[PDB]
């Protein structure tokens, strides 16, 4: 499992418009990246993603250059999810085969639900280096929400 | 790979409303089942699924009791996809971990796109027995469409 202080693995995340190398996409920026177990699922669609949409400008007021969401979904599902949620301020990234997630050691087996998905987490990434890493407790939503990240930028 | 004349594996397919045992869900019925590589993808959303929605009553006029679509997606994505497409006549089934698909030998590795997905195919299932099996050629859409299935029910 990746830890604070490490640079992200040189992996790729896809977007429908491109296979972004995350080391190039996040370079020179303060990036907030939060991961969800699945597009269109309840917690992700009713709490997690909406929380970052609502606080997007507050986060950018505190120096964030880019807010991004990643999920083990394909880019077509991620694009349709962003439109359903009106997540214009959020960059939706697809980890369709969970290769980025596995390289982080942050995968989890949801078995019959949806196979390998990402654990729920949130990071603050400064020029590719993981500065803050908030990984949720199983089936819990407490530390990866936008409010906690905002309070981390308070220090 | 499963073949005509065999009964389906005693696997489960999920729906958001339930882990349907397919041997019980399809029993006593003439079922048309078609599989797509992914919800919200272009061919599936613009050609494959719409073709079965448009010809649903014609298929049932020729003795089909149930039209079902399966995909290696989770049940939340499948439900949201059905609503986006207005697929009220179609039963959307989720094979989230591709266990049903792998038991059929009809999986395919889409690598970085979306990991393991289903090959595109269409079956006619009579009381759990595969009567007709139309499996597409790679990246081809010719034999699994509603029109071909309709012409199979012609004989």
Residue numbers in the entry:
A (entry chain A), B (entry chain A): 1 to 17, 22 to 159
Could you give the paper's own sentences about this structure?
V. vulnificus Prx3 (VvPrx3) belongs to the 1-Cys class of Prxs, with one conserved catalytic cysteine (Cys48), and has been shown to be involved in pathogenicity in a mouse model. Cys48 is the CP residue that is crucial for the function of the protein. All three crystal structures of VvPrx3 revealed a protomer exhibiting a compact and spherical structure without a C-terminal extension region, similar to the previously reported 1-Cys Prx AhpE from Mycobacterium tuberculosis. All three crystal structures of VvPrx3 [reduced Prx3 (C48D/C73S), oxidized Prx3 (C73S) and H2O2-bound Prx3 (C48D/C73S)] showed a similar dimeric assembly in the crystals characterized by an A-type dimeric interface, similar to that in AhpE from M. tuberculosis.
To study the structure of Prx3 in the reduced state, crystals of a VvPrx3 (C48D/C73S) variant were also obtained. The CP Cys48 in VvPrx3 was replaced with a non-oxidizable Asp residue, which could also partly mimic an over-oxidized form (Cys-SO2H) of VvPrx3. The crystal belonged to a different space group, P3221, and the VvPrx3 (C48D/C73S) structure [named reduced Prx (C48D/C73S) in this study] was determined by the molecular replacement approach. The crystal structure representing the reduced Prx3 showed a typical dimeric interface, called the A-type interface.
